[PDB]
Write a protein that binds this ligand. Structure first.
Ligand SMILES: C=CC1=C(C)[C@@H](Cc2[nH]c(/C=C3N=C(/C=C4/NC(=O)[C@H](C)[C@H]4CC)C(C)=C/3CCC(=O)O)c(CCC(=O)O)c2C)NC1=O
Ligand SMILES: C=CC1=C(C)[C@@H](Cc2[nH]c(/C=C3N=C(/C=C4/NC(=O)[C@H](C)[C@H]4CC)C(C)=C/3CCC(=O)O)c(CCC(=O)O)c2C)NC1=O
Ligand SMILES: C=CC1=C(C)[C@@H](Cc2[nH]c(/C=C3N=C(/C=C4/NC(=O)[C@H](C)[C@H]4CC)C(C)=C/3CCC(=O)O)c(CCC(=O)O)c2C)NC1=O
Ligand SMILES: C=CC1=C(C)[C@@H](Cc2[nH]c(/C=C3N=C(/C=C4\NC(=O)[C@H](C)[C@H]4CC)C(C)=C\3CCC(=O)O)c(CCC(=O)O)c2C)NC1=O
Ligand SMILES: C=CC1=C(C)[C@@H](Cc2[nH]c(/C=C3N=C(/C=C4\NC(=O)[C@H](C)[C@H]4CC)C(C)=C\3CCC(=O)O)c(CCC(=O)O)c2C)NC1=O
Ligand SMILES: C=CC1=C(C)[C@@H](Cc2[nH]c(/C=C3N=C(/C=C4\NC(=O)[C@H](C)[C@H]4CC)C(C)=C\3CCC(=O)O)c(CCC(=O)O)c2C)NC1=O
Ligand SMILES: C=CC1=C(C)[C@@H](Cc2[nH]c(/C=C3N=C(/C=C4\NC(=O)[C@H](C)[C@H]4CC)C(C)=C\3CCC(=O)O)c(CCC(=O)O)c2C)NC1=O
Ligand SMILES: C=CC1=C(C)[C@@H](Cc2[nH]c(/C=C3N=C(/C=C4\NC(=O)[C@H](C)[C@H]4CC)C(C)=C\3CCC(=O)O)c(CCC(=O)O)c2C)NC1=O
Ligand SMILES: C=CC1=C(C)[C@@H](Cc2[nH]c(/C=C3N=C(/C=C4\NC(=O)[C@H](C)[C@H]4CC)C(C)=C\3CCC(=O)O)c(CCC(=O)O)c2C)NC1=O
Ligand SMILES: C=CC1=C(C)[C@@H](Cc2[nH]c(/C=C3N=C(/C=C4\NC(=O)[C@H](C)[C@H]4CC)C(C)=C\3CCC(=O)O)c(CCC(=O)O)c2C)NC1=O
Ligand SMILES: C=CC1=C(C)[C@@H](Cc2[nH]c(/C=C3N=C(/C=C4\NC(=O)[C@H](C)[C@H]4CC)C(C)=C\3CCC(=O)O)c(CCC(=O)O)c2C)NC1=O
Ligand SMILES: C=CC1=C(C)[C@@H](Cc2[nH]c(/C=C3N=C(/C=C4\NC(=O)[C@H](C)[C@H]4CC)C(C)=C\3CCC(=O)O)c(CCC(=O)O)c2C)NC1=O
Ligand SMILES: C=CC1=C(C)[C@@H](Cc2[nH]c(/C=C3N=C(/C=C4\NC(=O)[C@H](C)[C@H]4CC)C(C)=C\3CCC(=O)O)c(CCC(=O)O)c2C)NC1=O
Ligand SMILES: C=CC1=C(C)[C@@H](Cc2[nH]c(/C=C3N=C(/C=C4\NC(=O)[C@H](C)[C@H]4CC)C(C)=C\3CCC(=O)O)c(CCC(=O)O)c2C)NC1=O
Lengths: 111, 56, 177, 164, 177, 164, 164, 177, 164
């Protein structure tokens, strides 16, 4: 999933960041912001949604050493087999960068 | 696809989620990848995040 | 996601119409009251804590049937959700009086809102009561006709925007009925 | 809700699992100290009209600014609603001595308290300090038993803790 | 979710009833029968692999129409879901026997469960037969009237839980009827 | 849709937030240059039959290969549909002078234009170059005001930019 | 791991939430029946060489087919490993009387037991029935206390239940 | 993950050994100390917002370097992020005493805690100063040497818990350093 | 009685016709209905001690003038006489859920009763509060099965059409 597989270097997190930008571009297809990344209604939950992920971003690199090692083999188990079939370039992008291929989120849930 | 089919449909997917909440807690841990809050309690505030997602 | 500058556009597209000067004087009077609408909506967002304050105050003033336990609206987490639901209509019609148009209401809360309320046991007769308090203070806030709070203004007619906010909250009041 | 029933029969369902003896053990601690917990409940049922009035103007002694117009206590109609407000806190703390945990507090009177009060220009600092008046207002071998005040006093400073 | 300590507060919260010692003594019998209540629930979780092999074998003993192919319950994956559905109803009544309350049965199992079975095609009559074997062996397990299996106990009457477990299994049966 | 209303009332909903003065400021720039924007709209409403015909065979001068059978312009029935096709582009650009942004362009006449045309063997190179004929076809102090052409001309080279 | 610490400090982290009094209540049931739980542990520590030998040929009485070549018990070298195998089950059940739940069982000796044994042609039916010999092999007011056998016996039929 | 019950079973796991009648007499202190351990843990969790407001104020008492603008901890969300981090040492050192072991503390916060603080620019000297305030107030709450707070107790020693809680805040002080 | 089966028997005697499958139709229609109908028909014999001190005095909570001279509570043995007419009027409700029709009542209860009660001068508008408490205390998916308390209402307020 997102925010659970930790990147190793600056190079992995940057293309992890860049594939998230197209998932912004999917859910924000044009100049209107969608109704579905609204993540809040009141002033209290506006900044609560920001500090919720930053504790969960820490709990990726906090929890273990082998389950997060199993994540980087698991990240090819969603992308290689049912997201980028036929593209070898997009296949070795997973096996060279699993944490970048883990927030690619092609389950179009408009988020 | 039916009123009877519509009220059927949310029950097994609740059971699909409770199947899959029981693979997260295969071993009996609420495992740390699932997070649904902050430091301050605010999961009743993140109830209103998720019930907005229930509503939107 | 639709406004007063886009409402007259989509009605030209049932008829493929090139918009010339026959209708734009209604739009040239919409750009006349741009700052007048902006002086109106600056007075609404001035005391937007006070508008949600006065609504559920005067709604529990008339009906203690909610505050009786075993009823709906007796308790504070419910009144949290009630003052979640209270401000959101005020937060959404402030987008609408900004727009000169009620289309931004018409999908962001106005879909599904009446039958979600019957799924939780929400009495809709209190909802049409509290929006009437919300209607009555807001027309007394776009003008200079509050009790104590008089902002500084250039004076003149503000009843055209008062007809717009009066046509907004009853459309809420018909969609919650 | 919130009790030990909400812990162990829910975690066995969250594990998809039997009520094993981890779950059967957790309710035994209810039984040996329900007698400790439930002579505290009829104290504030016996004083359900006694200590609401002594907490309001103990709060309004140290919050005496409210009586001006334009604030939270501008007339007696506010103060007629204000003794309703402390008693509605006081109803729930009585019920949490019965269910064991803070069951009726969080889902009814705690969650989203920080979205209501100063939006209705009600001061939250007077709300915890009216409760913190009643927090130290106890005398453990004299009012109740010595096994009864430690459930009572731990819920009242929790009310300042849950507003934090 | 909800239990016998919390059953006596929700009718009292609905009337704002300050709870005093007029209804405590029914809970004080529940306090005094704590160890008797746990005495029945450890004879029912200690043979739960026996009962799931006793009931649907006893259900296929009485009616061989399901193992006929083209019937409901005949093949290998199909019998895996028979032990799947059959074990999970024993997990929920063992929750319900402990609470003094079938409320935790009523929400996690007993919502909509009946017509999911006929949106599948489960015969509801065979599920009344399987739950009645599970009613009849479990009342023989909370006492000492089993065939071979006698655990060590402390003697006396314990029919008050046998009336409790018989008022639970028909609540399963009336839900699937 | 696509306007400044689609920016700030949607971003305040995307933040779950009030219409604060960041949102109230963004529409003030509509008001001071709607008079700049809306004498351009009645030009191409006044020339809605004038410049459709002058753009078709200006395109068909530099794309004169179409008249053979087996291509996109094999008969006058194609050319009767072809002046419909440039005018349907020309309808939307008139509407984007009214809504401010490119509102009626992207959700109606731009998105998925690169899944249609050469699949219907229609040349996309003639589509931008018919528009690029009309892009430079302006004269800013003579046809319209000087404050009117810079909204017009920035939308026409956008039509080549949005097909890129 | 698997205990009540694995329930409530993990669910408060899964809610992103304080250790509230739902979490503080759940460990009180450890305290009142750890004395019930931990005179059972030194029984099978005192009989850690006594009941391994009495369970092997009680299993090998009702599974006496193993001694042929080509099967799971073709020599004494298998039987020297076989008393290791029941004792390695017997180590973990002793530890689950200490941690409360079935902590050392599931993550070490239960999960993926159904991917190993008949792949190594080891019969799983003899594995549960060697344990089911020891399941009824108890006498609650005579070997241990009456408060000690109900944690012991509920873990042994669980071993047949977890292989199901 | 693992209480002070279960430190003595994972080293017997490594020897293929079992917990025989020689190692658990400290455990038979540890089960006979069930209600003296319980009488310390009400005294910490009753005044939990005292101790996070006594530590961060005593940290800004000794250090006006963070209150300067451009420092670590001076502004609004920033000091709000302190009361996130100020309680979470107190949050898990409760469970270090509730379980009896700091193994519930060692994986759940102490993994990667120091390297995030230099990645967030948090100075570790103010972190190790504020936890020494939290040690000094917790040892005066489990005992009877507070200023004004006088809870009811039964007399006897609990210096065995005072050495257990002193071996806890040093362990988090070695892991944030 | 007017039962589920007894309708088509006299209809077979009316024309000289036979039982067809439409005469056989509603016997399935009761056995598809009564999978939970006998739960509340058992619970009318299963809750009949708390409800005789609920519904026997639910008349007396509203009709407080029954201790007037000239009423049913001037003497103590006539306070028994209204209580058996809740005790028989929950044993006949126990007898009315099982027939299908109003079988006990149209032979014994309604049989002349509009003539009966005003010459003995017993108020039949005071008999409704013995039945009205059995119409609002009904929370169906906690007391009975969820279908079963809907049909239990329908026999119960049909008596209200007889008295009023
Ligand atoms: C549930 C909360 C609850 C309360 C707090 C009381 C509120 C209360 N407490 C006291 C009882 C009191 N009794 C004492 C005597 C004491 N002797 C000592 O050695 C101690 C220092 C001190 C224990 C506080 C004091 C100081 C008061 C408060 C002052 C007063 O008498 O009103 C009284 C006066 C009548 C009486 O004595 O009972 C009242 C109305 N009632 C309630 O229902
Ligand atoms: C919305 C788009 C739009 C258009 C472009 C015009 C199209 C158009 N423009 C011109 C008007 C024109 N006026 C000029 C004169 C000019 N003098 C100068 O100093 C400049 C170099 C140059 C500005 C282009 C030229 C070169 C033409 C095009 C040739 C022509 O006259 O047809 C004419 C001829 C009649 C007239 O003069 O109005 C037409 C039909 N109408 C429209 O509705
Ligand atoms: C943790 C598991 C564990 C065990 C099961 C035992 C195993 C075991 N139990 C018994 C003790 C026994 N004691 C009895 C007597 C009894 N009297 C009654 O009224 C009952 C019916 C019955 C309780 C079973 C019987 C039948 C046996 C087993 C047969 C035997 O004596 O070996 C003996 C013989 C020596 C002795 O008496 O202690 C042994 C080795 N040890 C262990 O460590
Ligand atoms: C770094 C992580 C990374 C991936 C795992 C892949 C997967 C991927 N491809 C596309 C997007 C695309 N992906 C392809 C790729 C292919 N189409 C084919 O016909 C071939 C079989 C296959 C490999 C050549 C194409 C042509 C597009 C553009 C059209 C589209 O949106 O699908 C997108 C959406 C936005 C984007 O381009 O990133 C993603 C996530 N691309 C990535 O950047
Ligand atoms: C019994 C309980 C009770 C109350 C709590 C008050 C609440 C209250 N206020 C108003 C009515 C109003 N309330 C306001 C709002 C405000 N006025 C101010 O001075 C502030 C600036 C701002 C709150 C922050 C306005 C502007 C009106 C319209 C008339 C007026 O000016 O008072 C109404 C009438 C609503 C309607 O007409 O539909 C009610 C019931 N009145 C009551 O009868
Ligand atoms: C069952 C749960 C429950 C609670 C926890 C309280 C909390 C609470 N109080 C008020 C509402 C109020 N609460 C107060 C009370 C006070 N204002 C002060 O500044 C004093 C400190 C204090 C008096 C001692 C007042 C005066 C109002 C009315 C505010 C107004 O109408 O303007 C409201 C809004 C709805 C209502 O009017 O009831 C809520 C949820 N009330 C509840 O029903
Ligand atoms: C045959 C049908 C049948 C009934 C209609 C009830 C009738 C009934 N209800 C209660 C007693 C009760 N019943 C409820 C439950 C409820 N209170 C509410 O506010 C809700 C409407 C409802 C479901 C949530 C509660 C909470 C009590 C105890 C407290 C009280 O009386 O309010 C009692 C007293 C003894 C007992 O607890 O069982 C009885 C006899 N029982 C039955 O067997
Ligand atoms: C022809 C097919 C056929 C079967 C497969 C069995 C299955 C079976 N068992 C019981 C009935 C029972 N089954 C058990 C269960 C058990 N008894 C034990 O000795 C073990 C300890 C445990 C299995 C692990 C019990 C306790 C009863 C109650 C009566 C009895 O003691 O036998 C019933 C009757 C259920 C009822 O009365 O509603 C049936 C059909 N019997 C059959 O006729
Ligand atoms: C968590 C694990 C756990 C258990 C397994 C039980 C075990 C158990 N049952 C009983 C004790 C008893 N149990 C029953 C009930 C029964 N007795 C029978 O013979 C029937 C099999 C059954 C009917 C349901 C009776 C009637 C007593 C006697 C009460 C007494 O001895 O005072 C006692 C004596 C304590 C007491 O109730 O006074 C104990 C410890 N308790 C627990 O805490
Ligand atoms: C409202 C939005 C809208 C548009 C943006 C255009 C775009 C467009 N044009 C055509 C369709 C067409 N467009 C053209 C036009 C041309 N072919 C050329 O090569 C020349 C450059 C040009 C004439 C000047 C022709 C000839 C067809 C018909 C193609 C065919 O049927 O084979 C179609 C397919 C459906 C249809 O026939 O309308 C679409 C979507 N039409 C629209 O309805
Ligand atoms: C710590 C966890 C742990 C366990 C739960 C057991 C389970 C287990 N047993 C064996 C392995 C074995 N287990 C057995 C035992 C038996 N075969 C039978 O059919 C009899 C029923 C029984 C003897 C009483 C034998 C004979 C082997 C060796 C199989 C072989 O090498 O062919 C293995 C493969 C690795 C190994 O050799 O150890 C494992 C994981 N052993 C463990 O280390
Ligand atoms: C310069 C500013 C300044 C402060 C803000 C306070 C803050 C403060 N408190 C304590 C020290 C303490 N603080 C407390 C906590 C409390 N004591 C109580 O009476 C309450 C019940 C509870 C707050 C809710 C305790 C129990 C101690 C231990 C010694 C003592 O009892 O005072 C220490 C010493 C820490 C140490 O020695 O390591 C400091 C700096 N003191 C200061 O010098
Ligand atoms: C539900 C929650 C719950 C509790 C809070 C405890 C409450 C509690 N604490 C103690 C009892 C005690 N508690 C302590 C501990 C202390 N005494 C002091 O003066 C120091 C301040 C502190 C050091 C930490 C001591 C020394 C005893 C006396 C032990 C004895 O009397 O044998 C006892 C008497 C039983 C006993 O230990 O013998 C009880 C019931 N039990 C519970 O079930
Ligand atoms: C088996 C069939 C059967 C019934 C259908 C019911 C109905 C019923 N109630 C009464 C009989 C009665 N019912 C009442 C009751 C009341 N009078 C009033 O004024 C109040 C409205 C109400 C108070 C509760 C009294 C007082 C009598 C006896 C008449 C008398 O002695 O005065 C009788 C007359 C015969 C008898 O004494 O039982 C019958 C048939 N009870 C039954 O046993």
């Amino acid at each position: 999933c997102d925010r659970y597989a930790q990147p190793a270097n600056k190079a992995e997190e940057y293309i992890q960041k860049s594939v998230q930008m197209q998932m912004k571009k999917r859910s924000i297809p044009y100049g209107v912001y969608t109704t579905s990344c609204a993540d809040g209604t009141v002033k209290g939950m506006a900044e609560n949604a920001r500090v919720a992920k930053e504790s969960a971003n820490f709990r990726a690199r906090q929890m273990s050493a082998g389950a997060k090692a199993a994540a980087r083999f698991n990240a090819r188990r969603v992308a290689n087999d049912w997201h980028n079939n036929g593209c070898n370039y997009e296949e070795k992008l997973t096996s060279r960068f699993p944490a970048a291929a883990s927030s690619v989120r092609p389950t179009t849930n408009r988020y | 696809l039916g009123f009877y089919g519509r009220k059927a449909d949310d029950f097994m997917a609740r059971s699909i989620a409770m199947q899959a909440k029981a693979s997260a807690a295969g071993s009996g841990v609420y495992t740390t990848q699932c997070s649904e809050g902050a430091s301050k309690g605010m999961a009743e505030n993140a109830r209103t995040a998720s019930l907005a997602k229930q509503f939107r | 996601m639709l406004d007063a500058f886009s409402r007259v556009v989509v009605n030209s597209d049932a008829k493929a119409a090139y918009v010339g000067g026959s209708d734009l004087q209604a739009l040239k009077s919409f750009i006349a009251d741009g700052n007048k609408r902006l002086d109106a909506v600056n007075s609404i967002v001035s005391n937007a804590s006070c508008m949600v304050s006065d609504a559920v105050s005067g709604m529990i003033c008339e009906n203690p049937g909610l505050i009786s336990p075993g009823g709906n609206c007796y308790t504070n987490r419910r009144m949290a959700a009630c003052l979640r639901d209270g401000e959101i209509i005020l937060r959404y019609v402030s987008y609408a009086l900004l727009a000169g148009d009620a289309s931004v209401l018409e999908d962001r809360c106005l879909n599904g809102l009446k039958e979600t309320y019957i799924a939780l046991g929400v009495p809709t007769n209190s909802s049409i009561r509290a929006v009437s308090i919300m209607k009555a203070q807001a027309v007394a806030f776009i003008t200079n006709t509050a009790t104590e709070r008089k902002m500084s203004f250039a004076a003149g007619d503000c009843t055209s925007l008062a007809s717009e906010v009066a046509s907004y909250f009853d459309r809420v009041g018909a969609a919650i009925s | 809700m919130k009790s030990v029933i909400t812990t162990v029969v829910s975690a066995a369902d969250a594990a998809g699992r039997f009520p094993s003896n981890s779950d059967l053990e957790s309710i035994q601690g209810n039984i040996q100290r329900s007698a400790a917990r439930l002579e505290a409940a009829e104290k504030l049922a016996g004083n359900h009209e006694a200590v609401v009035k002594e907490a309001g103007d103990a709060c309004f002694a140290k919050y005496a600014y409210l009586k001006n117009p334009g604030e939270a206590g501008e007339n007696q109609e506010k103060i007629n609603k204000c003794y309703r407000d402390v008693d509605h806190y006081m109803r729930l703390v009585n019920y949490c001595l019965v269910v064991g945990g803070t069951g009726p507090l969080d889902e009814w009177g705690i969650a989203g308290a920080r979205e209501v009060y100063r939006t209705l220009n009600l001061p939250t600092s007077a709300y915890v300090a009216s409760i913190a008046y009643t927090r130290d207002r106890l005398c453990v071998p004299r009012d109740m038993s010595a096994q009864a005040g430690v459930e009572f006093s731990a819920y009242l400073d929790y009310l300042i803790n849950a507003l934090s």
